[PDB]
Amino acid sequence: HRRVRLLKHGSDKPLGFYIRDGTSVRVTASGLEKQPGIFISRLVPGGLAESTGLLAVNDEVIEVNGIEVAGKTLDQVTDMMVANSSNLIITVKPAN
């Protein structure tokens, strides 16, 4: 896991990434068990997230500012992020 801080410049400018629903493959004593998850689907060209080189397409979003997204909907998680947009920190599980 990596904690990624995303800075915000314009009040009207987005942090520069899209999120989507996905499937997380996770490990349990039984074996690999699928679970719903939230992922970065793409980055805005020229945007803030891109420019950092810290977020990648298909990184899995694990937490928004310390709060796990497990069990939340895509809209709920979107609302968490934008609320926190001035000081957004996301814990990701990198695709690489």
Partner: peptide
Amino acid sequence: PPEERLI
């Protein structure tokens, strides 16, 4: 609902 959300 929409399948992608801009942040």
